[model samples]
Target: MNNKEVELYGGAITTVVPPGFIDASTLREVPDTQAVYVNSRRDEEEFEDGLATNESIIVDLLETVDKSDLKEAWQFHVEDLTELNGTTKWEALQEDTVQQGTKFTGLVMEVANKWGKPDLAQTVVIGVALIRLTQFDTDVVISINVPLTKEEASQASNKELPARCHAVYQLLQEMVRKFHVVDTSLFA
Candidate 1:
């Protein structure tokens, strides 16, 4: 995957994304508080056939939630996604801390059949980073969603899932490292 510098929130924020990921705002209506990117290389035909590449990256500027366990703060965002996405089964896969001068907590989780029907569930791997901006009373969340096709999901038992999860996690780490807040005024 190639790295591409992506401007977010009208250039107030910036980060790096992988190749083929295009700004989702160009294709659909998006909220002002978020920056969304999707895999433009995915074929619409495949999407309709239930074998689509539903990979995406999302960055959110949200009011900070009060939580004492700062290291576990990312869980709040992931759980919210589970509810918002209507994922039937979701599980936390891993957790780690990314130490840049700024400490960002990293999490990996999986949702069963996020895009597919319950009976024919396609698995989705989600990588998340929670950056707590206490001074600004904000939480900056960066998430990467990678959905597997029916075939891949069926064989994900011991093969593709872990590798894909690792790859997605790496991407998430890269995103965090490259994430820059160009204008703090956006938060103000």
Candidate 2:
């Protein structure tokens, strides 16, 4: 995936993300609780059928919610995502569950889009990763937007979302694995 370890939140946090990803903060105001990156190459070339213009990887630090069940936590995140996307019609498939031997737990899910915007209808694949830090009362969410061209979307069946998204999936997994809290004070 042409990955590299990049520091976030002033190096208080660290994670692996792809090269050629320009920090969105450089272009516009970004939230202090989030780190956003966009694939600059998305314009010049396509990485795969899933990569399209404006595709991004966003990492966010959120206050932990009351949901105790990790699955429900995942649901909460995806629900919030759908709302943000302005689309209520969407489907999701749980892709993986992560347990890092007591430090944190994570869940990966793929969201299929059925949208109100005709131009974007059925052309967006949202890759989500939610990592729970219960001890710290926090949740670190890594959301990757995989927007495919309408032509590309028509060529690939919905059943192939995961297969067609292997790189995005791998990027999320690597980010989850390499994500580290270099300074707990960032959360304080």
Q: Work out the TM-score per prediction.
A: 0.79, 0.80
lDDT of each residue in 1-188, candidate 2, tens digit only: 56889999999988987777898888999998899999887467755444445668899888887887776787687778766666565556336667642222232332333444534455666778888877788888788887665665664444554444566777777888888989998877
lDDT, candidate 1, equals: 0.70
Model 2 residue 137 CA deviation in Å: 1.2
lDDT of 1 at 76: 75
Model 2, position 102: C-alpha lDDT score: 22
Best by TM-score: 2
Model 2 poorest 10 in a row by lDDT: 101-110
TM-score of 1: 0.79
Q: Which residue pairs show collisions in model 2?
A: none
True-vs-predicted CA distance for residue 154, candidate 2, Å: 2.3
